[PDB]
Structures are given as structure tokens and as C-alpha cells.
Amino acid sequence: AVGACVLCNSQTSLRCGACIRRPFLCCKCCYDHVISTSHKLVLSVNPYVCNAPGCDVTDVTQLYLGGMSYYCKSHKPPISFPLCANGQVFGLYKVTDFNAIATCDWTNAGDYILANTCTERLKLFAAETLKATEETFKLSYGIATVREVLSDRELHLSWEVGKPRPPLNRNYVFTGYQIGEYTFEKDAVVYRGTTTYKLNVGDYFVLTSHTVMPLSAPTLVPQEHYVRITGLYPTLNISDEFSSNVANYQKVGMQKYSTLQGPPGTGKSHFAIGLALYYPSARIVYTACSHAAVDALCEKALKYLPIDKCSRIIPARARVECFDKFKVNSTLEQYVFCTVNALPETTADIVVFDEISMATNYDLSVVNARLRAKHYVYIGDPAQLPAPRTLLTKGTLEPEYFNSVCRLMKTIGPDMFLGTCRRCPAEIVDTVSALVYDNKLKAHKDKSAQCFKMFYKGVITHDVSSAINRPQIGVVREFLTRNPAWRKAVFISPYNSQNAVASKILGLPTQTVDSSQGSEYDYVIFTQTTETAHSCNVNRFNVAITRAKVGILCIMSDRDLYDKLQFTSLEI
Ligand SMILES: [Zn+2]
Ligand SMILES: [Zn+2]
Ligand SMILES: [Zn+2]
Structure with a gap:
């Protein structure tokens, strides 16, 4: 029962029994918590409860120390000191933001805002608390x-x-x-x-309700800037293919951690794998939250890195099929590709954490706890989709609040920015550059003249709450007959029920905007389905239209996002 205060690290035996994570609180901070919240149960070796037989007084403000035991006002002996006095709670070794994190239900956006704007120890307390709250909700x-x-x-x-x-x-x-x-x-x-x-x-x-383990490591280690590249040995024979990233690879070796904002198709995985060719003797652990993000890094490494120095870490409880071309579960290989939840306890010269918009502070902390590295590189894009917050129903979660890395990228700017989109037709690049990149994203490709938009509200039906727009699918069907090259398109919408309907009616492969992230297709048919906060979300809209390499058809419900699309408009 001996530990450190979550608010000021002061030593104490005083935990909070009313907090779902039982945080240690010092004498001053325990007081400021009990006197401002509904949390009145204080813990130690023995709880602060009335020691008198059959007494149910557990409120620390209504309790006193009578010798060595605790009693309420009705059972205390004449010589007794109140447990709560002079801004302190009695304990050995003798906050507004902590209170809000400790008592919120995590259904409001403001709860996540606070969990990301608070001090570092409060970020871990908020992450542990949130995850435990999300797990206890699974029982419902x-x-x-x-x-x-x-x-x-x-x-x-x-x-x-x-x-x-x-x-x-x-x-x-x-x-x-x-x-x-x-x-x-x-x-x-x-x-x-x-x-x-x-x-x-x-x-x-x-x-699957899983036990939430406590967090020890910060979301971000303390930043260190160096005068020279530290612990890494660069090549003077760096392939021309990777020469564009040499200054950024050097920045990586001259800082403890670095952030890379890479808009769609700007070269994130090429940068990540090229970092291995720039520091060829460095042991690199490539990590991401999803198996798909890790597999996309394996695919790029298969093309540039020796297959004998690679290993794909797969957990024994193999949930989905993943990358089969590297030797499986050899933790000792120079290149280790593994999801965050399957990371072994190991060290590395560089840790590359990809698809950072999908990470939570819980993931950020887990990486710092399992991996001890000379350098940490966070790759992603705050203009892309965050991890779903199952408890959040009120308010929208802005990119600066997705996690600590995204907060930095949105406030102080990222360390490195990949400014040229090599994937998308210029119509798409120009639209998203203006929409979410402050006109800083440039198109490598010319306009394809195969980017179309149609403003068609259709009819919205619902399969419980997941939306369907059959008339928007009917418009796609009509377009497909007149444009048979589009037979090869991937159908994308913000809703699984819309996708299930489109699959049967069109026969196109289907993908939600959220599952399309990180993937690219020649042709994309996107039906907005509804005008909701979900389907009008600029990050989701950004991911949706940037999946296309050649052409895109957007059947829109929202006039705002339709007017923003720099596409040829279609009639019918
Ligand atoms: Zn304290
Ligand atoms: Zn509490
Ligand atoms: Zn009593």
C-alpha cells in the first residue's frame, strides 16, 4: 500500500477507493479530491471506515482518528482528530483536472480534450481510467x-x-x-x-472484455535534441530512391523522438523502410495498432530489406490472417514488425510507430513500456481517422485531441511533413489540400479528368442506426452501365449497411471509409449515404476521396462538401 501521488508524486499510503483505477493521492491532493467530488472513500493498509461495530460511515469528511482506529462523529472518543482538516487527509508522510478525469463517464468530447491537455501523469490516469470504463461497458x-x-x-x-x-x-x-x-x-x-x-x-x-493493465511509461518520453546523430551510423551510399528523405533521416538521429505528418500517398512507408537503408546497422522495430498497418510495412520491407533480417511477430491467439513472407516470432531479428498489443519486452536503435492518428494514449504508453529505444519515430496524419471511441456520443473529437503525438502535430507542427501526394489525381489533391492541409499538399499527378461528383440526397433508411441510401446506389448502377471501365471500382461509404446493400446490387468489392484507410485503388465509388456528423466529418471525407489513384465518383448528400469537391459534376 506504499506508492506515489498521481498529481504531485509525493509519497503516501492514501489511495482513492471511489476511483475505478485506485490512484495514490497525497495528503493535500486526497483532500482536494474528496472535498470537491462525490468520492469520499479513502484507502490505506486498512480503509478509512468507522471501526465501531455495524457502522456504515465510510466518508472521510465524517471520520476521525481515535487513538489508532477511525470512527465517525457518533462513535469517536473524546480525544480524536478529524481525518479531514487544514487542506489535508491524515496519512503517512504528511487537482480540478484530476477530479474531472476521475468522475467523468467518457461520453462527452470534453472528457477526451481534458485527457490530452492535462499533465503527463494525468494523461496515463485518464488512459487507464478510460480503457477500464470502456471494458466495464462491454458487460452491458x-x-x-x-x-x-x-x-x-x-x-x-x-x-x-x-x-x-x-x-x-x-x-x-x-x-x-x-x-x-x-x-x-x-x-x-x-x-x-x-x-x-x-x-x-x-x-x-x-x-471480449479484457483486464486493463496499469500504465507506467509516459505517452511520449522527454524530448532530447542532439548536436550529432546519436547511436546511429548513416551510409554515404544511400540509394537515389531515398535521397529526398536524407535530411529527415538525419533529423531522426538528432532527436530522441520525431513526428512525421504524411498526407495520403506522400511516402510514409517508403520513408519508414528507407530509414533502415539510411542506418543499415540499426535494429528497427516497426509497430502500429492494426495488423493491416503492420502488414503494409512488411510489404514495403519485403521490397527493400533483406528477408533474412525480418520477422513478423504474431500473437498465439491469432485473430486475423496477416503477413506470411517473414520468419514468424523471431524477436531477435534486425527488423521486427509487430502490432502494439503483441510487442515483446525488447530494445531497439529505432522504433517506428506508424498510423499514429489510430493510436490512443494507452497505446503510446504501452510502446514506451515494452520498447527501450535510442530513437522513436511517429508516422501518421492528424487529418486522417482516429481510433473509434466506443463511449463517446456527445461532441466531436478534434485531431489535436486524438493522442499526444497528434496534439503536438496540430499545435507546434510536425517535425517532418511529406508535401507531395504521388497517388491521387490532382482534382483530389487540390480538394484535400484546401480542406485539411492548409494548401500545403501538392499534386504530383496531373488531373485525371476521371473525378466526378453528383449531388443526390436520395432516401435514407436505417438498419438499426447504420444508414442505407438505395437511390444513391441506383445512381451508381446507372453510372456503371454508361461507364463500364468503372466495373473494377471499390465501393466506399461511411456505413456497413450501405456497403452490404451496394455489394448485392452492384457486385463491387466494398469498404467503409474507416477500413479503407491505408489502402489505395484505381477507381473509387463513394456514396455519402447521409448528412450526419459521421458522414460529413472532414477527416473521414479526406480518407474517403484520397483512396483513388485514377478516378472517383462521389454521390454527395452534403452541399458543403459537394461544393468543395474540385470535380466535374454529373447530371441525372
Ligand atoms: Zn499530490
Ligand atoms: Zn476518486
Ligand atoms: Zn461510526
Whole structure:
């Protein structure tokens, strides 16, 4: 029961029993917490509760020290000192932001704003608290029981009454009963088990609620600037392909950590892999939150780095299929590609943390705790999508509040900025450069004259809350007949239910804006589906239209974003 204060690091035995994470609070900070919040239970070796038999006084403000035991006003002996007095709570070794983090329900944007603008120790307390709150919320949903099996990819479900039903998308991964993880897509539903198993009627599925481990390491280590490249040995034979990044690679070796803002198709993975060719003897750990982000780094490394010095770290509880071309689980290899949650306890000369807009402060801290590195490089784009905040329902989360790295990129600017988009037709580059990049993103490609926009509100229907716009899909169908080259397009929308409908009607491969991030396609057909905060979100809009290498058709619901698209308008 001996530890350090979360607010001022002062030593104490005084924890808070009312906080879900039980934080240690010193005498002054414990007082300022109990006297300003509903939190009145204070912990130590023995709790601050009335020692009198059958007494339920647990409020520290109503308790006193009577010799060596604690009693309320009704049971205290004549010679007794109040536990709360002179701005302190009695304890051994004798805050407005801490209070708000400790007592919020995490459903408001303002809660995440505070969790990212607070001191470093409060950022870890907010991250631990938020994650535990998100996990305790998983218990609220209702069990789905297999009532009948139709085919190898379709079934019918029986839901638990009294408990709400979770949205059926690839975002929520169920746990079948321990017969492997399972996913669902919309009474006939589509079943996708991570393990091929003959779906048993009667067997139940439940959401994976995991124990939230405490955070020790900061989200960002303290910054260090050096006069020379430190612990890294550069080449004087750096391939012309990577010469554009030489000054930035040198910046990487001259700072403890560095941030790289790379808009879509500006060369983030090329920069990340080229850093290995610039410091050829450096041990590099390549990390990201998702298996897809890690796999995209493996694909680029397969092209430039020796396959014998690479290893893809895969957790024993293999959830989805990932990169098979490197030797699996050899932690000792020079190049290690691994998701944040599967990182081993190891050291590195450089740690590259990619798709940083998708990281949370919990992820930032975990990386600093498992990896001890000479240099840390954070690659991503605050103008792209953040990790979904399942508890957040009120207010919008701005990019400067996604995590510590994004906060820095949006306030002091990033250390490095990749300014030339090599992927997209100029119509798309010009639109997103003006929309989210302050006119600093330049187009390498010419205009393709294959970027179209149509303003069509259609009809909005809902599959629970996930939206569908059948008339917008009908407009796509009509366009496809007149433009058969577009037969090869990927259909993108902000909603899985819109995508399920488009899949059956158009036969195009489908992708939500959020699952399309990091991917690129020659042709993209995007239907906005609705005018909601979700479908009008400028970061989501940015990702959506920057997936296209050659052409894009945007069927829009919002006049604002439609007018901003620098595309040829279509009629019908
Ligand atoms: Zn304190
Ligand atoms: Zn508390
Ligand atoms: Zn009492």
C-alpha cells in the first residue's frame, strides 16, 4: 500500500477507493479530491471506515482518528482528530483536472480534450481510467445464441432480453463458446469465424472484455535534441530512391523522438523502410495498432530489406490472417514488425510507430513500456481517422485531441511533413489540400479528368442506426452501365449497411471509409449515404476521396462538401 501521488508524486499510503483505477493521492491532493467530488472513500493498509461495530460511515469528511482506529462523529472518543482538516487527509508522510478525469463517464468530447491537455501523469490516469470504463461497458450488451445455421457463411440469432444489442460490424469482435473469435454483418445475417468451425446451435457468443493493465511509461518520453546523430551510423551510399528523405533521416538521429505528418500517398512507408537503408546497422522495430498497418510495412520491407533480417511477430491467439513472407516470432531479428498489443519486452536503435492518428494514449504508453529505444519515430496524419471511441456520443473529437503525438502535430507542427501526394489525381489533391492541409499538399499527378461528383440526397433508411441510401446506389448502377471501365471500382461509404446493400446490387468489392484507410485503388465509388456528423466529418471525407489513384465518383448528400469537391459534376 506504499506508492506515489498521481498529481504531485509525493509519497503516501492514501489511495482513492471511489476511483475505478485506485490512484495514490497525497495528503493535500486526497483532500482536494474528496472535498470537491462525490468520492469520499479513502484507502490505506486498512480503509478509512468507522471501526465501531455495524457502522456504515465510510466518508472521510465524517471520520476521525481515535487513538489508532477511525470512527465517525457518533462513535469517536473524546480525544480524536478529524481525518479531514487544514487542506489535508491524515496519512503517512504528511487537482480540478484530476477530479474531472476521475468522475467523468467518457461520453462527452470534453472528457477526451481534458485527457490530452492535462499533465503527463494525468494523461496515463485518464488512459487507464478510460480503457477500464470502456471494458466495464462491454458487460452491458446482450448474449447472442445460435438458433439456426443456414450455410457456411449465414446464420440466425436469438438475443438476450433486457440487455441492449451491439451494432453488427467488423468493429465488434465476439468470442464464441472458447471456440475462436467471430464477426457478423447484416433476419438473415452473415457469420465470419476467425477459426473454421461448424457453427453449433445453442452455443453462445460474448464480447471480449479484457483486464486493463496499469500504465507506467509516459505517452511520449522527454524530448532530447542532439548536436550529432546519436547511436546511429548513416551510409554515404544511400540509394537515389531515398535521397529526398536524407535530411529527415538525419533529423531522426538528432532527436530522441520525431513526428512525421504524411498526407495520403506522400511516402510514409517508403520513408519508414528507407530509414533502415539510411542506418543499415540499426535494429528497427516497426509497430502500429492494426495488423493491416503492420502488414503494409512488411510489404514495403519485403521490397527493400533483406528477408533474412525480418520477422513478423504474431500473437498465439491469432485473430486475423496477416503477413506470411517473414520468419514468424523471431524477436531477435534486425527488423521486427509487430502490432502494439503483441510487442515483446525488447530494445531497439529505432522504433517506428506508424498510423499514429489510430493510436490512443494507452497505446503510446504501452510502446514506451515494452520498447527501450535510442530513437522513436511517429508516422501518421492528424487529418486522417482516429481510433473509434466506443463511449463517446456527445461532441466531436478534434485531431489535436486524438493522442499526444497528434496534439503536438496540430499545435507546434510536425517535425517532418511529406508535401507531395504521388497517388491521387490532382482534382483530389487540390480538394484535400484546401480542406485539411492548409494548401500545403501538392499534386504530383496531373488531373485525371476521371473525378466526378453528383449531388443526390436520395432516401435514407436505417438498419438499426447504420444508414442505407438505395437511390444513391441506383445512381451508381446507372453510372456503371454508361461507364463500364468503372466495373473494377471499390465501393466506399461511411456505413456497413450501405456497403452490404451496394455489394448485392452492384457486385463491387466494398469498404467503409474507416477500413479503407491505408489502402489505395484505381477507381473509387463513394456514396455519402447521409448528412450526419459521421458522414460529413472532414477527416473521414479526406480518407474517403484520397483512396483513388485514377478516378472517383462521389454521390454527395452534403452541399458543403459537394461544393468543395474540385470535380466535374454529373447530371441525372
Ligand atoms: Zn499530490
Ligand atoms: Zn476518486
Ligand atoms: Zn461510526
